[PDB]
């Protein structure tokens, strides 16, 4: 059919794809620092992390007004991790493991919107 | 004239178009998170926009959003 939650699941597919490029550009920046100017590698990382956290804030806000609380539970723990980084503002091995999980989490949830949206459109 | 389900869809589409235009203007005209909201607001209210997107991937968002606010306003009237 046509519901407000069905349209919210459609905007996520276009927006979550942009969040994929951020975590992919992150592992590239960490790969360059592992091989080795150093200011440009970290200052750019500070500029890319802010939109990634703000865009996900809409994912927790769109589904809140869409009454789809079954999907919100799959995004609340992701937003809680952003509060730890925002509060406090070797490290290479720790941050590397803290970024590979982002690519897997932003991809497994990406397939949900590709299927949960179909579960409402064709189900008219 | 417009159901309450459409008014909730317009606001999130307005912000959704705005955040995409900011992401398009980031991979490369400033078009920050603030100027994109102003340009999209001036385009939805049929007013004269201050600036226009320079890149092709930014011009697509402008032309598509222009067709969106034209159909919605014409349907509301």
């Amino acid at each position: 059919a046509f519901t407000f939650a069905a349209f919210c699941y459609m905007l996520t597919l276009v927006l979550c794809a942009s969040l994929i490029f951020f975590v992919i550009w992150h592992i590239i920046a960490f790969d360059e620092l592992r091989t080795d100017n150093i200011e440009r590698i970290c200052c750019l990382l500070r500029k890319l992390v802010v939109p990634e956290y703000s865009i996900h804030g809409l994912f927790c806000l769109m589904f809140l007004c869409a009454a789809e609380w079954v999907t919100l539970g799959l995004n609340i723990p992701l937003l809680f991790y952003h509060l730890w980084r925002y509060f406090h503002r070797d490290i290479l091995n720790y941050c590397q493991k803290e970024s590979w999980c982002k690519l897997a989490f932003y991809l497994l949830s990406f397939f949900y919107y590709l299927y949960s949206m179909v579960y409402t459109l064709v189900s008219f | 004239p417009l159901a309450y389900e459409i008014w909730m869809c317009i606001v999130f589409a307005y912000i959704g178009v705005s955040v995409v235009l900011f992401l398009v203007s980031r991979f490369s005209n400033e078009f920050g998170i603030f100027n994109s909201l102003w340009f999209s607001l001036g385009a939805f209210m049929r007013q004269g926009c201050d600036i226009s997107p320079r890149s092709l991937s930014g011009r697509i968002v402008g032309g598509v959003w222009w067709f969106f606010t034209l159909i919605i306003i014409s349907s509301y009237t």
Binding site: - | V24, G63, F67, F68, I71
Partner: peptide
């Protein structure tokens, strides 16, 4: 239909931005 057109335009713009970023 206009919402579908909006979503398709956003997706096409994202793809064109990806292409133009990978062009360099």
């Amino acid at each position: 239909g206009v919402f579908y057109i909006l979503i398709g335009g956003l997706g096409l713009a994202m793809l064109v931005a990806l292409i133009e970023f990978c062009y360099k």
